Amino acid sequence: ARALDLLRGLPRVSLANLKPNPGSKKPERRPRGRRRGRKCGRGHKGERQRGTRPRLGF
RNA sequence: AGAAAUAACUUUGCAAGGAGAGCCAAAGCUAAGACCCCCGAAACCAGACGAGCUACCUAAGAACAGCUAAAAGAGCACACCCGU
Ligand SMILES: [Mg+2]
Ligand SMILES: [Mg+2]
């Protein structure tokens, strides 16, 4: 084929070369820094923030 | 001191079928990736431990000078007790 000819002049494939397909492994989000975490997205004081808002549909 | 589903979005496989039984299917299924904090009440209920402090009670013991007065929850006043 065409690509199979490309592989001949590249380095050997091994577990040091692999990669995920771009766009698959979305990066993670952690509350650290001035953007992600100062209130970590939970908003001002209120039962929204503490994780105590009424049941779904109240 | 940011743990996780329901959908959605992205990338793969296979595609009228997907999935290694059960499930879904009028382009859908299978897989992965992403997203939901920490400290703090007065309390409540159950079972234990406490009357060597203090409140009261029981058994058997102990103390209460001297003076005045004689059988009195008597007067002055030590030990003793209390705490204006
Ligand atoms: Mg996380
Ligand atoms: Mg006693």
mmCIF file of C-alpha atoms (C1' of nucleotides) and ligand atoms in Angstrom:
data_model
loop_
_atom_site.group_PDB
_atom_site.id
_atom_site.type_symbol
_atom_site.label_atom_id
_atom_site.label_comp_id
_atom_site.label_asym_id
_atom_site.label_seq_id
_atom_site.Cartn_x
_atom_site.Cartn_y
_atom_site.Cartn_z
ATOM 1 C CA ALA A 1 0.000 0.000 0.000
ATOM 2 C CA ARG A 2 1.069 3.605 0.569
ATOM 3 C CA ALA A 3 1.155 3.867 4.367
ATOM 4 C CA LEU A 4 2.761 0.446 4.711
ATOM 5 C CA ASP A 5 5.608 1.853 2.642
ATOM 6 C CA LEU A 6 5.880 4.829 4.983
ATOM 7 C CA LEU A 7 6.297 2.537 7.988
ATOM 8 C CA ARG A 8 9.453 0.994 6.539
ATOM 9 C CA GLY A 9 11.492 4.175 6.930
ATOM 10 C CA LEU A 10 10.232 5.068 10.392
ATOM 11 C CA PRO A 11 11.484 3.697 13.707
ATOM 12 C CA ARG A 12 10.263 0.382 15.031
ATOM 13 C CA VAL A 13 6.848 0.483 16.670
ATOM 14 C CA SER A 14 6.940 -0.235 20.388
ATOM 15 C CA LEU A 15 5.259 0.719 23.630
ATOM 16 C CA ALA A 16 7.418 3.862 23.694
ATOM 17 C CA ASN A 17 5.779 5.238 20.528
ATOM 18 C CA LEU A 18 2.044 4.701 20.918
ATOM 19 C CA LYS A 19 -0.399 7.566 21.225
ATOM 20 C CA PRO A 20 -4.138 8.070 21.617
ATOM 21 C CA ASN A 21 -6.153 9.127 18.628
ATOM 22 C CA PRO A 22 -6.400 12.935 18.818
ATOM 23 C CA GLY A 23 -9.700 14.195 20.162
ATOM 24 C CA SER A 24 -10.425 11.043 22.155
ATOM 25 C CA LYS A 25 -8.703 11.573 25.513
ATOM 26 C CA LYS A 26 -10.254 14.811 26.661
ATOM 27 C CA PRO A 27 -8.108 16.393 29.404
ATOM 28 C CA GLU A 28 -9.121 16.313 33.048
ATOM 29 C CA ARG A 29 -10.354 19.167 35.230
ATOM 30 C CA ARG A 30 -9.143 19.662 38.794
ATOM 31 C CA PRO A 31 -9.764 22.651 41.046
ATOM 32 C CA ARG A 32 -6.245 24.054 41.247
ATOM 33 C CA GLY A 33 -5.102 27.500 40.171
ATOM 34 C CA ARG A 34 -6.770 30.859 39.895
ATOM 35 C CA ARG A 35 -9.216 29.641 37.271
ATOM 36 C CA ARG A 36 -10.314 26.109 38.105
ATOM 37 C CA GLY A 37 -10.389 26.476 41.882
ATOM 38 C CA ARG A 38 -10.975 29.468 44.062
ATOM 39 C CA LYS A 39 -14.548 28.389 44.652
ATOM 40 C CA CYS A 40 -14.018 25.421 42.330
ATOM 41 C CA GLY A 41 -17.118 26.253 40.328
ATOM 42 C CA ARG A 42 -19.665 25.844 43.099
ATOM 43 C CA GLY A 43 -20.685 29.475 43.378
ATOM 44 C CA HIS A 44 -21.372 31.769 46.296
ATOM 45 C CA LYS A 45 -22.523 30.635 49.716
ATOM 46 C CA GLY A 46 -25.891 28.914 49.655
ATOM 47 C CA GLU A 47 -27.222 25.416 49.693
ATOM 48 C CA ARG A 48 -26.184 25.080 46.061
ATOM 49 C CA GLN A 49 -22.537 25.277 47.109
ATOM 50 C CA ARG A 50 -22.659 23.024 50.163
ATOM 51 C CA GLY A 51 -24.238 20.227 48.151
ATOM 52 C CA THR A 52 -27.592 20.330 49.920
ATOM 53 C CA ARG A 53 -30.202 21.425 47.430
ATOM 54 C CA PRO A 54 -33.603 19.733 47.380
ATOM 55 C CA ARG A 55 -34.420 16.529 45.567
ATOM 56 C CA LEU A 56 -34.738 16.409 41.803
ATOM 57 C CA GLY A 57 -38.124 17.891 40.997
ATOM 58 C CA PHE A 58 -38.791 19.867 44.165
ATOM 59 C "C1'" A B 1 -10.436 20.013 51.214
ATOM 60 C "C1'" G B 2 -14.484 17.770 43.727
ATOM 61 C "C1'" A B 3 -15.775 10.710 45.116
ATOM 62 C "C1'" A B 4 -20.628 9.296 40.749
ATOM 63 C "C1'" A B 5 -25.206 8.691 37.269
ATOM 64 C "C1'" U B 6 -29.285 10.418 33.405
ATOM 65 C "C1'" A B 7 -28.550 12.530 28.676
ATOM 66 C "C1'" A B 8 -25.206 15.184 25.411
ATOM 67 C "C1'" C B 9 -20.243 15.982 22.873
ATOM 68 C "C1'" U B 10 -15.383 13.734 20.809
ATOM 69 C "C1'" U B 11 -12.735 9.625 18.934
ATOM 70 C "C1'" U B 12 -12.440 4.271 17.632
ATOM 71 C "C1'" G B 13 -15.008 -0.971 15.937
ATOM 72 C "C1'" C B 14 -19.260 -2.958 13.478
ATOM 73 C "C1'" A B 15 -23.192 -1.161 10.804
ATOM 74 C "C1'" A B 16 -29.872 -2.740 9.421
ATOM 75 C "C1'" G B 17 -27.695 -4.463 13.006
ATOM 76 C "C1'" G B 18 -24.501 -3.796 17.618
ATOM 77 C "C1'" A B 19 -22.942 -6.530 22.284
ATOM 78 C "C1'" G B 20 -18.540 -12.480 24.790
ATOM 79 C "C1'" A B 21 -26.690 -14.853 26.537
ATOM 80 C "C1'" G B 22 -30.252 -11.112 29.645
ATOM 81 C "C1'" C B 23 -30.189 -4.978 26.427
ATOM 82 C "C1'" C B 24 -31.143 -1.625 22.664
ATOM 83 C "C1'" A B 25 -32.414 -0.937 17.210
ATOM 84 C "C1'" A B 26 -37.378 3.760 12.130
ATOM 85 C "C1'" A B 27 -28.604 4.699 11.882
ATOM 86 C "C1'" G B 28 -28.179 2.513 15.626
ATOM 87 C "C1'" C B 29 -25.314 -0.141 18.949
ATOM 88 C "C1'" U B 30 -20.477 -1.539 21.773
ATOM 89 C "C1'" A B 31 -15.845 0.827 24.196
ATOM 90 C "C1'" A B 32 -13.261 4.729 26.068
ATOM 91 C "C1'" G B 33 -12.732 9.886 27.371
ATOM 92 C "C1'" A B 34 -15.238 14.289 30.542
ATOM 93 C "C1'" C B 35 -18.636 16.074 35.367
ATOM 94 C "C1'" C B 36 -20.948 16.600 41.344
ATOM 95 C "C1'" C B 37 -15.519 19.189 48.328
ATOM 96 C "C1'" C B 38 -13.349 20.052 53.927
ATOM 97 C "C1'" C B 39 -14.011 21.763 59.154
ATOM 98 C "C1'" G B 40 -18.013 23.205 63.099
ATOM 99 C "C1'" A B 41 -23.366 23.055 66.711
ATOM 100 C "C1'" A B 42 -26.811 23.051 70.738
ATOM 101 C "C1'" A B 43 -29.274 18.199 70.356
ATOM 102 C "C1'" C B 44 -31.783 12.906 69.969
ATOM 103 C "C1'" C B 45 -31.896 7.558 71.225
ATOM 104 C "C1'" A B 46 -29.630 3.120 73.306
ATOM 105 C "C1'" G B 47 -26.360 0.686 76.766
ATOM 106 C "C1'" A B 48 -22.766 1.064 80.483
ATOM 107 C "C1'" C B 49 -20.044 4.092 84.987
ATOM 108 C "C1'" G B 50 -20.604 7.170 89.049
ATOM 109 C "C1'" A B 51 -23.517 9.332 96.076
ATOM 110 C "C1'" G B 52 -14.856 8.717 98.396
ATOM 111 C "C1'" C B 53 -17.499 15.910 96.444
ATOM 112 C "C1'" U B 54 -22.353 17.570 97.545
ATOM 113 C "C1'" A B 55 -28.431 16.493 99.076
ATOM 114 C "C1'" C B 56 -30.844 13.116 102.210
ATOM 115 C "C1'" C B 57 -31.099 8.638 104.988
ATOM 116 C "C1'" U B 58 -29.292 4.209 107.812
ATOM 117 C "C1'" A B 59 -25.785 1.327 111.455
ATOM 118 C "C1'" A B 60 -22.407 1.845 115.110
ATOM 119 C "C1'" G B 61 -18.868 5.713 117.201
ATOM 120 C "C1'" A B 62 -16.640 10.879 118.727
ATOM 121 C "C1'" A B 63 -16.373 16.242 120.187
ATOM 122 C "C1'" C B 64 -18.221 20.451 122.712
ATOM 123 C "C1'" A B 65 -12.736 24.817 127.634
ATOM 124 C "C1'" G B 66 -13.959 28.850 131.132
ATOM 125 C "C1'" C B 67 -17.593 32.169 133.186
ATOM 126 C "C1'" U B 68 -22.984 33.317 134.071
ATOM 127 C "C1'" A B 69 -26.962 30.307 135.085
ATOM 128 C "C1'" A B 70 -29.603 25.174 136.632
ATOM 129 C "C1'" A B 71 -33.066 20.386 132.895
ATOM 130 C "C1'" A B 72 -32.958 25.888 128.521
ATOM 131 C "C1'" G B 73 -33.400 24.627 120.271
ATOM 132 C "C1'" A B 74 -30.644 29.840 127.741
ATOM 133 C "C1'" G B 75 -26.427 34.696 127.720
ATOM 134 C "C1'" C B 76 -20.751 35.978 127.034
ATOM 135 C "C1'" A B 77 -16.977 33.191 124.971
ATOM 136 C "C1'" C B 78 -12.473 28.973 123.343
ATOM 137 C "C1'" A B 79 -11.829 24.296 120.325
ATOM 138 C "C1'" C B 80 -15.275 23.327 116.049
ATOM 139 C "C1'" C B 81 -18.688 24.954 112.177
ATOM 140 C "C1'" C B 82 -20.360 28.814 109.063
ATOM 141 C "C1'" G B 83 -18.939 33.043 105.703
ATOM 142 C "C1'" U B 84 -21.948 39.417 107.442
HETATM 143 MG MG MG C 1 -12.539 14.501 38.922
HETATM 144 MG MG MG C 2 -21.394 9.278 101.501
#
